[PDB]
Design an enzyme around this catalytic site. Sequence first.
Site, PDB file in Angstrom:
ATOM      1  N   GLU A   1       0.838  -1.184   0.000  1.00  0.00           N
ATOM      2  CA  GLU A   1       0.000   0.000   0.000  1.00  0.00           C
ATOM      3  C   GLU A   1       0.891   1.259   0.000  1.00  0.00           C
ATOM      4  O   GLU A   1       0.646   2.185  -0.772  1.00  0.00           O
ATOM      5  CB  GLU A   1      -0.968   0.006   1.200  1.00  0.00           C
ATOM      6  CG  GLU A   1      -1.817   1.306   1.305  1.00  0.00           C
ATOM      7  CD  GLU A   1      -3.176   1.126   1.994  1.00  0.00           C
ATOM      8  OE1 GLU A   1      -3.202   0.936   3.232  1.00  0.00           O
ATOM      9  OE2 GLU A   1      -4.222   1.196   1.298  1.00  0.00           O
TER      10      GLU A   1
ATOM     11  N   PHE B   1       3.801  -6.338  19.596  1.00  0.00           N
ATOM     12  CA  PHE B   1       3.688  -7.797  19.693  1.00  0.00           C
ATOM     13  C   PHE B   1       4.610  -8.395  20.761  1.00  0.00           C
ATOM     14  O   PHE B   1       5.783  -8.019  20.876  1.00  0.00           O
ATOM     15  CB  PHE B   1       3.929  -8.473  18.340  1.00  0.00           C
ATOM     16  CG  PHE B   1       2.744  -8.414  17.422  1.00  0.00           C
ATOM     17  CD1 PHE B   1       2.469  -7.256  16.682  1.00  0.00           C
ATOM     18  CD2 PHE B   1       1.901  -9.508  17.288  1.00  0.00           C
ATOM     19  CE1 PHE B   1       1.365  -7.193  15.814  1.00  0.00           C
ATOM     20  CE2 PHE B   1       0.797  -9.455  16.424  1.00  0.00           C
ATOM     21  CZ  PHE B   1       0.531  -8.299  15.688  1.00  0.00           C
TER      22      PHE B   1
ATOM     23  N   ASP C   1      -7.950   2.207   6.722  1.00  0.00           N
ATOM     24  CA  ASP C   1      -8.553   1.139   7.508  1.00  0.00           C
ATOM     25  C   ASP C   1      -9.259   1.740   8.726  1.00  0.00           C
ATOM     26  O   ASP C   1      -8.594   2.330   9.580  1.00  0.00           O
ATOM     27  CB  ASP C   1      -7.490   0.139   7.983  1.00  0.00           C
ATOM     28  CG  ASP C   1      -8.108  -1.174   8.431  1.00  0.00           C
ATOM     29  OD1 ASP C   1      -9.102  -1.571   7.812  1.00  0.00           O
ATOM     30  OD2 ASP C   1      -7.659  -1.803   9.399  1.00  0.00           O
TER      31      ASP C   1
ATOM     32  N   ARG D   1      -8.959  -9.757  10.063  1.00  0.00           N
ATOM     33  CA  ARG D   1      -9.346  -8.431  10.555  1.00  0.00           C
ATOM     34  C   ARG D   1      -9.616  -8.396  12.077  1.00  0.00           C
ATOM     35  O   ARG D   1     -10.364  -7.568  12.592  1.00  0.00           O
ATOM     36  CB  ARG D   1     -10.497  -7.863   9.717  1.00  0.00           C
ATOM     37  CG  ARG D   1     -10.031  -7.521   8.316  1.00  0.00           C
ATOM     38  CD  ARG D   1     -11.038  -6.714   7.505  1.00  0.00           C
ATOM     39  NE  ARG D   1     -11.368  -5.424   8.124  1.00  0.00           N
ATOM     40  CZ  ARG D   1     -10.537  -4.396   8.235  1.00  0.00           C
ATOM     41  NH1 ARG D   1      -9.300  -4.461   7.760  1.00  0.00           N
ATOM     42  NH2 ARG D   1     -10.928  -3.317   8.891  1.00  0.00           N
TER      43      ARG D   1
END
EC number: 2.4.1.27
Length: 351
Positions: free
Chosen positions: A22, A72, A100, A191
């Site tokens: 993107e 994470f 998003d 998602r």
Amino acid sequence: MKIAIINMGNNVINFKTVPSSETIYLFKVISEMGLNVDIISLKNGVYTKSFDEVDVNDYDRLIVVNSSINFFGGKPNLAILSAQKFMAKYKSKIYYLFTDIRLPFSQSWPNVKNRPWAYLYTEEELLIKSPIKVISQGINLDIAKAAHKKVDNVIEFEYFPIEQYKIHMNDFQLSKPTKKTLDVIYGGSFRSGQRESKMVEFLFDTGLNIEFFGNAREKQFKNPKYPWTKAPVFTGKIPMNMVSEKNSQAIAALIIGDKNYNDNFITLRVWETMASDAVMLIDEEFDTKHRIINDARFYVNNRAELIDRVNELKHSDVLRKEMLSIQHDILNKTRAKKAEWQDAFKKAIDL
Ligand SMILES: O=c1ccn([C@@H]2O[C@H](COP(=O)(O)OP(=O)(O)O)[C@@H](O)[C@H]2O)c(=O)[nH]1
């Protein structure tokens, strides 16, 4: 007019991952706009200049592509800390691209501030004080604005159909007629559970030959409120620049959105399917006013209507070719406005 563009939470390098594709895609469409753009990332590369080899204030515009502030394993995320440290030290306005609905601009210092390795950073070094300009891919700025409740430095909201970059890139072409091997196809991730009902509704227990290629795995579909017995075939992720070709091996391809994208965002996936050899089948709820294509054959309300529409498509080749022809045609009418989109984008970034 030197423009800098960056992913706020993801390393950028090639097209093997969506957040890097993107970003690179955007850098291209901006560059083809006649603009002078550099992507600034972790290390130098084919498309990138390294954050610690560039001084952010050399650019007259800092455009930032959305990302979560998730560390994470709780461990430092270099993509995040490098980008925020980078942004924190820019003196002017920041154009935050909201593609998003799940990745509002958010400040990392709060997180970091409380982790055990906090000492490795300072507030001064990671708190972005510059004023932010949110550019919304969704036409509803209340949803956009609502999403940025927690952040105060976000004084401006603007709508711009960011995802049309794909159809505006100079190398664009419509997919060619391909040999069918799938009935229905859908690519993407899980998602974070944000769309489990729609995915089960439309891709599980249909009786059709369906594939779900992407970062979605079957094991993730375990919510009791949305039960299924027969799951589609889940293959792995493929580069963002292969999507339409993948999509093209199916008679039809599925358009479903997050509850907030409904009649709000037009997603990248919509063009990826419309430019493909797989007939576009949109959830009626996603675009109730049929703004995408004004023909009701492109919209389905439930699993049963979808199964029925594919059956017709498998039955009438004439109807299949006719509908691809319509969507291809309808796609080009928007591409015919490539200039006005370039102008609008510029205006949007204050040019
Ligand atoms: O194997 C795959 C699956 C998906 N995608 C990209 O991921 C996007 C969809 O992302 P997401 O799952 O967030 O769906 P959305 O919310 O955009 O519909 C697609 O449009 C593709 O560009 C990709 O590049 N490779």
